[PDB]
Amino acid sequence: QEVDLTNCDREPIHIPGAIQPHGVLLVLSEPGLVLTHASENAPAVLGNSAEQLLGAPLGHFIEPSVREPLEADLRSARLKQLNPLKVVWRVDGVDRFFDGIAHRHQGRLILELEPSSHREAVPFLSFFHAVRDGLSRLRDARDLQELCEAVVQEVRGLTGFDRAIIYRFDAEWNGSVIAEARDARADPYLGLHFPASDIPRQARELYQLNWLRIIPTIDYQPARVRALPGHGEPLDLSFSVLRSVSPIHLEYLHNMGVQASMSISLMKDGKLWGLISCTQVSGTRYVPYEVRTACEFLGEVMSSLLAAKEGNEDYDQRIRAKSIHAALLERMAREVDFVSGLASQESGLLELVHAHGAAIHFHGRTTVLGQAPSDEALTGLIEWLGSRTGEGVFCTDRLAREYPEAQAFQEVAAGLMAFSMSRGRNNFVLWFRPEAVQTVNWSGNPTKAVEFDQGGPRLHPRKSFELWKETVRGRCLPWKAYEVEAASELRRSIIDVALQRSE
Amino acid sequence: QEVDLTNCDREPIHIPGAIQPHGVLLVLSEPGLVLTHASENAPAVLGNSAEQLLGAPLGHFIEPSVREPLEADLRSARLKQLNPLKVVWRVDGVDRFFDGIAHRHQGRLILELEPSSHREAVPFLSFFHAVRDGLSRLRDARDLQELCEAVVQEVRGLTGFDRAIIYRFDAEWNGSVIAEARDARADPYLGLHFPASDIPRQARELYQLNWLRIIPTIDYQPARVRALPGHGEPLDLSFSVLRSVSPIHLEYLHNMGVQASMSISLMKDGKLWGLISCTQVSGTRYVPYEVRTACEFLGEVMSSLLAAKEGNEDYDQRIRAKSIHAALLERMAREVDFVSGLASQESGLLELVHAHGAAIHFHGRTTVLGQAPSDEALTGLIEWLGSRTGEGVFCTDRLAREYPEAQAFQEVAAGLMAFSMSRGRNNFVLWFRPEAVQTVNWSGNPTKAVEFDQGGPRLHPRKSFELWKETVRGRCLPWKAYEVEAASELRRSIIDVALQRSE
Ligand SMILES: */C=C\C1=C(C)C(=O)N/C1=C\c1[nH]c(Cc2[nH]c(/C=C3\NC(=O)C(C=C)=C3C)c(C)c2CCC(=O)O)c(CCC(=O)O)c1C
Numbered sequence A, B: 001q002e003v004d005l006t007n008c009d010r011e012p013i014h015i016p017g018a019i020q021p022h023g024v025l026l027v028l029s030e031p032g033l034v035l036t037h038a039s040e041n042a043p044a045v046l047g048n049s050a051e052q053l054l055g056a057p058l059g060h061f062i063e064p065s066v067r068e069p070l071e072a073d074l075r076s077a078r079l080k081q082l083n084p085l086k087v088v089w090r091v092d093g094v095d096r097f098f099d100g101i102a103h104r105h106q107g108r109l110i111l112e113l114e115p116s117s118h119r120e121a122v123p124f125l126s127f128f129h130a131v132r133d134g135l136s137r138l139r140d141a142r143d144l145q146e147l148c149e150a151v152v153q154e155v156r157g158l159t160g161f162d163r164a165i166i167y168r169f170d171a172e173w174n175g176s177v178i179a180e181a182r183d184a185r186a187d188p189y190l191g192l193h194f195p196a197s198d199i200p201r202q203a204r205e206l207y208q209l210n211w212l213r214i215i216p217t218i219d220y221q222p223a224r225v226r227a228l229p230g231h232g233e234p235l236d237l238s239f240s241v242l243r244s245v246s247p248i249h250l251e252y253l254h255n256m257g258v259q260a261s262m263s264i265s266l267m268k269d270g271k272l273w274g275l276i277s278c279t280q281v282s283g284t285r286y287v288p289y290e291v292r293t294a295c296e297f298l299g300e301v302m303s304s305l306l307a308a309k310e311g312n313e314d315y316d317q318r319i320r321a322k323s324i325h326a327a328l329l330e331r332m333a334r335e336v337d338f339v340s341g342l343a344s345q346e347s348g349l350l351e352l353v354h355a356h357g358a359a360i361h362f363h364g365r366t367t368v369l370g371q372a373p374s375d376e377a378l379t380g381l382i383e384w385l386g387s388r389t390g391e392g393v394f395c396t397d398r399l400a401r402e403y404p405e406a407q408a409f410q411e412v413a414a415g416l417m418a419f420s421m422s423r424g425r426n427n428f429v430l431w432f433r434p435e436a437v438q439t440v441n442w443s444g445n446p447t448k449a450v451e452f453d454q455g456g457p458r459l460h461p462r463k464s465f466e467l468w469k470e471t472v473r474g475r476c477l478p479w480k481a482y483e484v485e486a487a488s489e490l491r492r493s494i495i496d497v498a499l500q501r502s503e
């Protein structure tokens, strides 16, 4: 069982057959560098037709003195480190200048050409500071929030986007905007939640691999990528910066009121954690390659720091809940065994994991502490690790899926964590949590997040992003990481004590 | 009491009262920013005497334009982020430009000024690309050794040092060169071992707190930090980048044949793991502060990845170990005396941690498995285990280090593996490895590491660093971290079955 939901997760965005037409995509044979593919916008950008290019060697169109470094670079195994290449394209006698961005993927050498001449300046001083002072602000951040604020302020200052946010995925791949830097121009998304389908699963899978994408304007005609005969199979554009993006996302950006967009993957343990997401409300945003990779660099630094800076918000605790634990075990070894065990130190047991009641059961006698579910009628609870093979700390809040006799018997307080303690599943330590009922602020209605069109209706994005408060029924207060390993620490140190059973 | 605190370990290296004279140290009163200390080398570097600086407010000597931004930066609570400060020092006619490095320690505002030289788009972009490429090369490393190799290559490329090593500390705080990048003509230090007293414990503890240090030339006259009347106590220079270093380290570097140095602390679990150590054979290396902190950042990233990169190693052996664990667990449970379950897998139990001998002591009671009885005067190691902090898993390269009677048996250099089961000092399993008589290559004679070259009350170091081989007994071949984790996992499985129960 995965995720796995709607028809959003299936359009193949990585082979649209087309690019964003402000640059030119070529692919080159190896080792000859014969153009086997070329986007059809080549007349405007390069002054040659796609059919003038297909079949010719790259060096034909290149100014003679730049042929050697350019061709040596393109033969290199070190492509990513060499980008951007200086390409000087010569048609008739005219020299045009481009950033060349080359990569290899799925057996194809792809070369993308973004014009480098007549564009805006990129002040050196601001680039210099965003990189050097950005590195030092991120290193010196004391918690996740400070790390996020530094990123969005540096990336906004470096790019000039109207809005740069940190967008953090949750366990169900919905996200929320946890930091925002913005021109007063633009509406705050800070605090808003967005449904998982805004960034469907095949997009998340692409973005775990290609950590940057830019749409300098959502208003463009895709330029087809033409191929020589016998090179007509779909060209994998997974790692091409000009890849034309899914029209359903381009429609979504129109409905949101954004004209240009750029986002950078945030990674943790090889998994997509979130995005740095930049949007322009009015106007285009043709961010040059060098600026983009400075933003990618800040995103890699933040990524490398993600696990550290969030753990820092718990080092204050832990040692608290660690010396708590060392008192509960100080009081099972010198004292009873386990019986009136953590029961005499009950607000150490429930200050261990912040619950309103416990529930033990060495074939007891159970033993609440208190206002547990039903007390008497909870004998349908003490079996549940005997259903899924896990041994195993069951830790939930929405008991509306795994045992929703929180609906055919409700109760509320249905916020449970339970670990087991012996082999043939019998005895159980349960912590319950009362109901902290919460308003979650969504951007537009999350239940109508996908729309259906015709006529066997196709897929369209929602049209309103107006704030939409959801009163969430079912859920407790979140099991911050420690309620499991602090419970894991307790489970095993009590098996230790329990083994003086063999007194 | 363990290791170590001897005579080298006592020079107060944090209060030399003097700095390295290529930059100037100031300390500024708060909130008034009056100069209360200043290093006597001010005339060459700054253009005035300490006599003029002391008593005067910092804004006097600062360019009028950047006066207020500089003072605001220095009154900020958050100085680390702001470094390097742009200090435009004005003395009548000339502006002199400095990197300002400010910090607070022991209640003093310390500002250190290093002559800056100005940055150029080329090679800032090149430096930026190297740091970005360096960062992703660390995150991409496939195991520990290759993270080490990547670090020394990146750091040497960034700094231009003749040599950069990873120097790793062992249990007794001796060190070893485990990775090196160098100009090929320089002698390879790779493989050399060095005694703990080369980096004595007050240095090691300072370096646990201040992670970066550079000696741009070992030939310098320390400049005294003068002070106003009434601040004449020793100024704690723990965190100053210009702090004058211990004279016995300088002459060590002289005897080693190096002219400049720079090192980066490597931290793991809050303890000094090693150094990134950079050396120049001839000539100086005034590495700019920007380049230095980029190297320190790469060291911080390496430190964050040490455990993860080691966890990647021995991929197949881990799956093998997990197999034995299942087969071992399977038969304690299918069985009378669960202890006999593992006794019947000499093959299984010994391979789990790649040992040639094991002993299980439980409720009595020793049964020995491998060719490693140490004879059944065994009841000595077992019993000594019955002290200590028996949980979790105890492990040593060299059993003599913690248990000096271990010298008497050539069958258990290792070193164990492992652990106590039922907490009470009662019941253990032990694994043994044979001893691999090997040569350790020291650089210089480690028994004359503190040579008295005259030589009464003063301390002097080695004059010779020539390779000095030594045959070592009682060291077993290191335990892999996956073998420790297998030992801990089996321990939790044995205690599960032991609790459970009757039949
Ligand atoms: C089922 C179809 C889709 C519906 C319905 C929908 O809402 N999106 C669908 C498909 C889709 N989206 C994207 C790419 C994408 N989406 C986002 C979402 C956000 N942008 C914001 O500013 C915020 C919050 C403030 C959210 C949430 C983002 C960031 C992206 C990445 C591209 C970008 O940065 O603009 C794709 C993939 C598009 C492609 O790569 O071709 C698809 C198929």
Ligand SMILES: */C=C\C1=C(C)C(=O)N/C1=C\c1[nH]c(Cc2[nH]c(/C=C3\NC(=O)C(C=C)=C3C)c(C)c2CCC(=O)O)c(CCC(=O)O)c1C
Residues within 6 Å of the ligand: B007, B008, B009, B011, B013, B165, B167, B175, B177, B189, B194, B197, B198, B199, B200, B203, B213, B215, B244, B245, B246, B248, B249, B252, B261, B262, B263, B275, B277, B279, B449, B450, B459, B460, B461, B462
């Ligand atoms: C007891 C006195 C000392 C003797 C004897 C000795 O040999 N050193 C003594 C004191 C001492 N050393 C240091 C700092 C230090 N030492 C090293 C050692 C090495 N440099 C190398 O290149 C290698 C291996 C190839 C080793 C081993 C290092 C790296 C350092 C850190 C300084 C630096 O990086 O150059 C101190 C503290 C010096 C200070 O900070 O003032 C002292 C007191």
